Design a protein around this ligand. Structure first.
Ligand SMILES: [Cu+2]
Ligand SMILES: [Cu+2]
Ligand SMILES: [Cu+2]
Ligand SMILES: [Cu+2]
Ligand SMILES: [Cu+2]
Ligand SMILES: [Cu+2]
Ligand SMILES: [Cu+2]
Ligand SMILES: [Cu+2]
Ligand SMILES: [Cu+2]
Ligand SMILES: [Cu+2]
Ligand SMILES: [Cu+2]
Ligand SMILES: [Cu+2]
Ligand SMILES: [O-]
Ligand SMILES: [O-]
Ligand SMILES: [O-]
Lengths: 278, 278, 278
């Protein structure tokens, strides 16, 4: 492999995070006060890393941080039941741990933490974060395994109820790339409804990484994946591989969803920066 | 492997089953008159076993037994069309067969019967058992392959429309375990609606067993799975592995579903029987 | 393997297709004027083949051809945005390409085009073909990999909203086979709703081909699969394997869907042409 690959993990990382009410009434996570985003900032670690997150809730209501897939003690559950939420103006240190796969004492295989995961609130609105998730308190988490292929760029697409990344319908978001770029997509679904994520002119493997192991990987190759609330998957593609440059549509394939504007553009540019037709 | 493993099948097993109307208007299967349950009793066999079920319908309406995955002749279809239902007060002997995987005469690979399956009624209410399934006429079936890891306990979680195991919302059910227990979950969905099964602090493999074959198994590791009517899957987890004891929530992640009480507790106790915080 | 297997691809194939308004108001694809069908004709190629489709839109509204999975340039996108639709009475030549899997220059594995895909309209009614898909402008595409097992017959089952193959509910369609036949099913879903495809007495692998690679294939074996709009999968079964002849039901397992008539019959006949009971 002549491409960049993820190293071995084991580092102890520290992070500061805030929950902010936005001017339009939404709620977002951020690494800096005044720089929150919906979806929240991407967190990327390696198998074996430990992450300490000093989380500060700047809003006037209780908020929390809850993560999927990664190892965390009950004190970092992010739920009101386990007293793991954060009071208004408060600060709490969450700890997320990751581990590598390996054989157990009984001989069974313990799975690793690697995967395309996500984090979100769990106490805003209801005891399951229905209000916080609706307001935009969600973000992606990537846990890499040693040797995983590293992309050129990563984009996060969240189907939150009837929006993409809490945006107004018919407003994208759109992304750009050049023919040959290794583009990574993190695909998260939240809210009430099922969806189907579809991409024109591109396909991926329905497995952990979206890439086939090799000639023996039996995982199916798809361009349409059904998703429900709290589903998260990801993949890597070569922009324009075997199809060339163009304005390549991605959208939900539930007919009324795409009709109502749950559509975006994957703009794959020629080496001279042009998109065929435009 | 120093853990208990499933032996080779081939035994001819006999079983007696009843369909009972319950005092509250529900309908349940049972191995003994007056001891019906919703969900019905678990049936567990090994690949190659044959199961003869003497089924007695004690109710005042026609009922039947229909199974997924296992081998059965058209006489054991459990449908009115094939005259395989049971009249009120009647008794009928169903036969379920299982087989091991192997190579066919043409060289192709024939799949085995192993998996996490389920049984349910097919004639109460409608010709597809809509009334019987709603009333609680469903239960799990496990078919083990030789060498499959055996658990310490098995729990069945059924998303039947807007209930868990036909229970009133906000009433669980809850389960208990100790840190280190090998807990098996059988997850069945019935009715009208899609769902997403989610577990806090625990994850499994999205394959036949929920366990990874080894370092080569490309199956994805998840903690959130979308399900539809008649879907059935299962997995095994080590209670508290890498996360410790605590009141670990399992729930549907469709936001209104968890808000309306489709939540339960996986109580993982410390060696001294305590749950952190309680 | 003593069964028929797919050869190596690489041929350049030519095809003529029409879009026709039908007398009942539906819309169908066809290889001949006056011989359109819903679902449209099956297109079957091998990995490496190139397909040139001379498509003629005979209807009074704009129509197009859009394919999943296969390689196509932006000029064959089939969308109004990319000026790839066809005017009333017009003719346009689409090009679909396929490729074999292989190792990239960076050492990564490029997936092949093989799979169970489908084609449909993208501009009738809305800019996503909501009207054309509803009217019946959809059909299956099979891309075979060298060595793939060839079936005795292929049947296409499309869950288009609340219909099977745009048929009136309670009208099938039904299929026939003989015990031992190698039957292939192409299963496509379109429209607004999720479904679950279920088959009595038969099961398949949830992978690319529906067949297990061998003793090492970890893919799950199922008889119930959830599907959403634009999902496409397929499989092969031996008719009556381990279960014998009979009228074997296939249906959606969403309870109201089967109750409303989204049911069909897989009639597996004895060597003398009889179905047990009839
Ligand atoms: Cu939760
Ligand atoms: Cu959608
Ligand atoms: Cu498409
Ligand atoms: Cu969650
Ligand atoms: Cu049925
Ligand atoms: Cu639910
Ligand atoms: Cu969670
Ligand atoms: Cu069923
Ligand atoms: Cu499209
Ligand atoms: Cu359906
Ligand atoms: Cu069935
Ligand atoms: Cu499409
Ligand atoms: O959650
Ligand atoms: O069924
Ligand atoms: O599409």
């Amino acid at each position: 492999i002549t491409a960049r690959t993820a190293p071995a993990g084991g580092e102890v990382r520290h992070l500061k995070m805030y929950a902010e009410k936005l001017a339009d009434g939404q709620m977002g996570y951020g690494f800096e006060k005044g720089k929150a985003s919906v979806p929240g900032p991407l967190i990327e670690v390696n198998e074996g890393d430990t992450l300490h997150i000093e989380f500060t809730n700047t809003m006037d209501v209780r908020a929390s941080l809850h993560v999927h897939g990664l190892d965390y003690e009950i004190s970092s559950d992010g739920t009101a039941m386990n007293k793991s939420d954060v009071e208004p103006g408060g600060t709490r240190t969450y700890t997320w741990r990751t581990h590598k796969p390996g054989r157990r004492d009984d001989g069974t295989w313990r799975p690793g933490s690697a995967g395309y995961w996500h984090y979100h609130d769990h106490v805003v609105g209801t005891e399951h974060g229905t209000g916080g998730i609706r307001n935009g308190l969600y973000g992606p988490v990537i846990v890499r395994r040693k040797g995983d292929v590293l992309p050129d760029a990563t984009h996060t697409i969240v189907f939150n109820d009837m929006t993409i990344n809490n945006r107004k319908p018919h407003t994208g978001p759109d992304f750009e790339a050049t023919v040959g770029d290794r583009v990574e997509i993190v695909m998260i679904t939240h809210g009430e409804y099922y969806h189907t994520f579809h991409m024109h002119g591109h396909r991926w493997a329905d497995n952990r990484t979206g890439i086939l192991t090799g000639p023996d990987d039996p995982s199916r190759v798809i361009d349409n994946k059904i998703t429900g609330p709290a589903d998260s998957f990801g993949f890597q593609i070569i922009a324009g591989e075997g199809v060339g440059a163009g304005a390549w549509m991605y959208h939900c394939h539930v007919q009324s969803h795409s009709d109502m504007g749950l559509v975006g553009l994957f703009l794959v540019k020629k080496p001279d920066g042009t998109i065929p037709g435009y």
